[PDB]
């Protein structure tokens, strides 16, 4: 049920190698659908999903406008801060900017946020109310006091609670074929003997969307149970995800181990056990 | 639909 339209901007300065690098990416849920990169000599917002391919010419124009505006502001914000933190023009620095809205399982507005990070650390962070900020720093505090006027006038508020949600609903309808199709995991357990005393049991989930998933190993009876190595969810490269969970178990005890998988695409959660 | 800043740091 839970849906999000998020957007991720990265400005990176390039001392004496031309002017600063800028990149946008936008995601509906776990599916990137757009991209801007100013390193084109005619920079444009372009589609990165098949369901953005037959859009109006005005849509892309209006988004290319927003984008080149952000690149130019952030080109400045990099010089501005380099100042505040009294750093030379030799040091290459990083601005990252993140804004999105989140709906709940039940479809209602959960939260929005707009977030600034300089050299990998929080800088300006927008609060719950979408009106105040938590600036991390004496330097940030300057940039807080400069951003208060706009967010008093609910600039960020109206974008997040209304605009973002409105367009999130649009994009889901545009690409529902893929965005709202619950493709569940293909799940198999593999057996890898370590010695005569042991073997690794590995529980695979494969080719599932969305990326939310729970692989938990369970063992019948009272005995000990060695930690699971749980590898972090990873893209297949076709918009589906992969995860596995692995247990080192004593030899013979192997049939007592059962692997559980929860995911929306599964009617009821599945159990597997290594089938010899 | 993305948001361009109305302020600067």
């Amino acid at each position: 049920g839970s849906h999000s339209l998020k957007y991720f901007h990265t400005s990176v300065s390039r001392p004496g190698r031309g002017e600063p690098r800028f990149i946008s990416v936008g995601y509906v849920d776990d599916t990137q659908f757009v991209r801007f990169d100013n390193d084109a000599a005619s920079p444009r917002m372009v589609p990165r999903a098949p369901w953005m391919e037959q859009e109006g010419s005005e849509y892309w124009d209006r988004e290319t406008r927003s984008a080149r505006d952000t690149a130019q502001i952030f080109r400045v914000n990099l010089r501005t801060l380099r100042g505040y933190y009294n750093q030379s023009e030799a040091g290459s620095h990083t601005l990252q900017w993140m804004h999105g809205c989140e709906l709940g399982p039940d479809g209602r507005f959960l939260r929005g946020y707009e977030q600034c990070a300089y050299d990998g650390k929080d800088y300006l962070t927008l609060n719950e109310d979408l009106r105040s900020w938590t600036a991390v720093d004496t330097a940030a505090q300057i940039s807080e006091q400069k951003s208060n006027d706009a967010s008093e006038a609910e600039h960020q508020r109206a974008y997040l609670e209304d605009t973002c949600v409105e367009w999130l609903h649009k994009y889901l309808e545009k690409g529902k074929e893929t965005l709202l199709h619950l493709e569940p995991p293909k799940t198999h357990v593999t057996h890898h003997p370590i010695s005569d005393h042991e073997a690794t049991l590995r529980c695979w989930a494969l080719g599932f969307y969305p990326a939310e998933i729970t692989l938990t190993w369970q063992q019948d009876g009272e005995g000990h149970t060695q930690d699971t190595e749980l590898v972090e969810t990873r893209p297949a490269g076709d918009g589906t995800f992969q995860k596995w969970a692995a247990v080192v178990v004593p030899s013979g005890e192997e049939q007592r181990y059962t692997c559980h998988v929860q995911h929306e695409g599964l009617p009821e959660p599945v159990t597997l056990r290594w089938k010899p | 639909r993305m948001y361009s800043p109305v302020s600067i740091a």
């Epitope: 502001i73 006038a153 | 109305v6």
Partner: T-cell receptor, first 112, second 110 residues
């Protein structure tokens, strides 16, 4: 910040004219407005760098705007009429909203 | 769309209050105000959505309904003689392209 030359221009009705505008150095948006006496400015056309984006419907095709280098901008009125007599204002901003500054203008009078 | 008084008098010190009309204000529109001194082109003074905002230059009240909005100047001096415009849009759909009223001629007799 926002300088305009010439600050005054006269022309024989039928002749052309070409004012210029120099925006604040970093401002990537540049806008042209048009003020007749005791009114308020009408939008003519705006730019993002060298890119002329929107451009008012009513605006005659005698009027054309240019921002070749994405810095200075020139407005050109061909085969001028009485009506054209106005204060031609230029504005700059850093993207939408931030730093929205105007010029003092170019005062045009067109004479028979 | 934005209608206001065409002109307004005042005495020096006498606190001024222009008010504006925009029944059909969008859910997502910003009350922004510009001040044009004689001979120079206009400049920004204040912006609001719903909260009362205050500044060096002026204040801005916005009533519950949102239909109206009132610009407020203090200790009004000769200086303050100018045309005052009331704008309602979003930079967001517009672009930052401004739509100006005829404004309100303020005079400050001594």
């Amino acid at each position: 910040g926002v300088s305009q030359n010439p600050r005054h221009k006269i022309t024989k009705r039928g002749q052309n004219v070409t004012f210029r505008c120099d925006p604040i150095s970093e401002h990537n948006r540049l806008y042209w407005y048009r003020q007749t006496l005791g009114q308020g400015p009408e939008f003519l056309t705006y730019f993002q760098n060298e890119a002329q984006l929107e451009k008012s419907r009513l605006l005659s095709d005698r009027f054309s705007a240019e921002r070749p280098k994405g810095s200075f901008s020139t407005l050109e009125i061909q085969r001028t009429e009485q009506g054209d007599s106005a204060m031609y204002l230029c504005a700059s901003s850093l993207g939408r909203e931030y730093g929205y500054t105007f010029g003092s203008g170019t005062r045009l009078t067109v004479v028979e | 769309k934005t209608t206001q008084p065409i002109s307004m008098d005042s005495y020096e010190g006498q606190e001024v209050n222009i008010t504006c009309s925009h029944n059909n204000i969008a859910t997502n529109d910003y009350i922004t105000w510009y001040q044009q001194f004689p001979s120079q082109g206009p400049r920004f003074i204040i912006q609001g959505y719903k909260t009362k905002v205050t500044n060096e230059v002026a204040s801005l009240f916005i009533p519950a309904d949102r239909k109206s909005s009132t610009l407020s100047l203090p200790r009004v001096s000769l200086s303050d003689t100018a045309v005052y415009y009331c704008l309602v849009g979003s930079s967001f759909n517009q672009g930052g392209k401004l739509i100006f009223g005829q404004g309100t001629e303020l005079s400050v007799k001594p």
